[PDB]
Nucleic acid binder design. Structure first.
Lengths: 140, 139
DNA sequence: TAAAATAGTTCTCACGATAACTATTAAA
DNA sequence: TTTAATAGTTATCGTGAGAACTATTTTA
C-alpha cells in the first residue's frame, strides 16, 4: 500500500464532511481554524489575544494568521482593535454573534465525538494516538 | 477540540514532507503531483484523461484541472487533446516526468522506512481499522 | 543611537471545495 | 433529434506555506 497518499485523501474527505455537517447545524465556517479561535476567545475572556497569539494556538504561519483573522472579521465573529500601549499590536475580541456561535459550536463538538467515535475503544484509541505521537516525533 | 489537533498534525506532516522532498530532488512531488506521476509510470499502457485523475486522487473537477496545469508547468507531463473524443485530453509523462517517478519511488521507500521505526504491525494494523471506522462513521 | 527582535500586511504559490459556464457525445 | 450526460475551464472561496516589505519597540 502507500502511506502518503491515503492519509491526505482520508483527511480531505473528513474535512469535507465536517464542513457539510457544520452548515446544517448552523455553525457554518467554524469547522476549522475559525471555530478553534472562537472557542479559545470564549474559554479565556480575560487574556488579550493578539494576531500573533493566534499563530501559536493554531500552529500556523504569519500570513495564515493574518488572513484567518480577516476572514473571521468578514464573517462577524470578531472585531480587531489596535492596541494603544503597543502601536504595532492588534487585539482580537469575540463579537456578540461570535459569543452566540461559540455556544452553538461547543454543542456541535459534543455531538461529533458522540457520533464519530462509535464502535471504537479508549484503548484502541489511546494506542493510535501513540502511533501518531511517534510518527510526529520521527520528524525532530 | 482534539479533532482540531488532527488537522494540525497533518499540517506539520504535510510541511515536513515538502522540506524532505525538495532536499532530496523530488520538489513538488510530495503531494498529488507525485501520486499522479507514479500512476502514469506504473501504468503506461492505459491512456489517462484529466477526469481519470479526479478518480485516482479523490479530488473535484476543478482541483484536478488545476493540478494537471501545475504539473505541465513543472515539466512532468504533456497534455494532448484526444482525436476521437474532442472533449477529452490525455496525460503523458515527459522525460523529466519518467526520471522523477524513479527518484520518487526511492524517496517513498526511504520515507516509509524512516517513519514507521519503533512501531509494530498490529499497532499499525489497528490504527487502520480505527481510521477505517471514523471514515465509515462519516458515511 | 545603531542594530535586532517583533507584529502585521501583501506577494506568489499549492492544494482543497462549489457553481456556472462551454463544448461535445450519447441516449431517449 | 431534442435532451442527458460527460469533459474541461474559470469564477470565488478556505486554508496552508515562504519571502519581502512597513512600522514600531527593544536591547546592546
Amino acid at each position: 500500500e502507500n502511506p502518503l497518499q491515503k492519509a491526505r485523501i482520508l483527511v480531505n474527505q473528513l474535512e469535507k464532511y465536517l464542513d457539510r455537517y457544520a452548515k446544517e447545524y448552523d455553525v457554518e465556517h467554524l469547522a476549522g481554524p475559525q471555530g478553534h479561535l472562537v472557542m479559545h476567545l470564549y474559554k479565556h475572556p480575560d487574556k488579550d489575544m493578539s494576531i500573533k497569539d493566534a499563530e501559536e494556538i493554531l500552529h500556523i504561519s504569519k500570513s495564515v494568521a493574518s488572513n484567518l483573522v480577516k476572514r473571521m472579521e468578514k464573517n462577524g465573529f470578531i472585531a480587531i482593535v489596535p492596541s494603544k500601549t503597543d502601536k504595532r499590536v492588534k487585539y482580537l475580541y469575540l463579537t456578540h454573534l461570535g459569543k452566540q456561535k461559540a455556544t452553538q459550536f461547543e454543542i456541535f463538538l459534543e455531538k461529533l465525538h458522540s457520533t464519530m467515535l462509535a464502535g471504537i475503544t479508549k484503548e484502541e484509541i489511546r494506542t493510535t494516538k501513540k502511533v501518531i505521537r511517534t510518527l510526529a516525533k520521527n520528524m525532530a
